[PDB]
Write a protein that binds this ligand. Structure first.
Ligand SMILES: CCOc1cncc(C)c1-c1c(C(=O)O)[nH]c2c(C(C)C)cccc12
Ligand SMILES: [Zn+2]
Ligand SMILES: [Zn+2]
Length: 233
């Protein structure tokens, strides 16, 4: 990639790439196959003093092991905590690897129940205070925000106040998206309302990072609403 945002075509098989978003903020990018198609996915890394906070796995056990190695190579600070932003395997697949590497894993109770029911890996610790739309809590160097049902009923977004970075996860799509992605667990009717809540809560966001694909600015929020409305119809 040589400084461009990593895509499947520039991540070697089985590997992970990092991308510097801001001072003390990186995204991580990996590739996975699902139902015979290949997808990229993102997560976040936020410096937390002399430790790191991880947001989301790298979509799979081996990808997540590779993520930890890439962090060691590129950053060299220990990952001590991880938050998963909803229950799908692109968010929790790799939690068992994290837990065996000494990382304390967290998710909302809603995510943990959904992951358990689905047969996905289950974060250890429950994040209370996020059950009502509009709720926010602090977690190390980030704020966690529950915008309401969107891509999933449990989806969380993450804001990094020091950098004005909004990590939307899978509730937010990249600008090139033409479709609403994997809508199996989505609430298409509520999704625009949930995006509006994000827009209202984080009007100073400078970088918006989707769950899959390229970061951009605030326009990703309105684009997401547009694509979801067009899909539903
Ligand atoms: C079925 C079509 O899904 C898509 C289509 N286009 C783009 C994306 C990113 C997806 C996609 C998303 C997402 O939209 O977040 N999540 C996925 C998962 C989870 C459940 C692990 C698996 C397979 C594909 C996706
Ligand atoms: Zn998902
Ligand atoms: Zn996703």
């Amino acid at each position: 990639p040589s400084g461009e945002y990593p895509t499947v075509n520039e991540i070697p098989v089985g590997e992970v790439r990092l991308y510097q978003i801001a001072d003390g903020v990186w995204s991580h990018i990996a590739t996975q196959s699902f139902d015979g198609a290949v997808y990229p996915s993102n997560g976040l890394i936020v410096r937390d003093g002399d430790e790191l906070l991880l947001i989301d796995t790298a979509w799979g056990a081996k990808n997540t092991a590779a993520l930890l190695a890439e962090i060691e190579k590129q950053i060299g600070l220990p990952v001590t905590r991880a938050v998963s932003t909803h229950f799908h395997d692109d968010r929790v697949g790799g939690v068992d690897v994290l837990r065996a590497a000494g990382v304390a894993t967290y998710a909302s109770p809603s995510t943990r129940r959904l992951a358990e029911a689905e047969g996905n890996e289950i974060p250890t610790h429950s994040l209370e205070g996020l059950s009502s739309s509009g709720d926010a809590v602090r977690f190390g160097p980030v704020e966690l925000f529950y915008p309401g049902a969107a891509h999933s009923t449990d989806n969380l977004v993450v804001y990094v106040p020091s950098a004005n970075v909004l990590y939307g996860g899978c509730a937010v799509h990249e600008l090139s998206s033409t479709s609403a992605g994997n809508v199996a667990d989505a609430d298409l009717a509520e999704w625009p309302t949930s995006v509006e809540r994000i827009q209202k809560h984080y009007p100073e966001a400078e970088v918006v990072i989707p769950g899959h694909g390229l970061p951009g600015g605030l326009d990703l929020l309105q684009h997401t609403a547009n694509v979801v409305k067009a899909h539903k119809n």
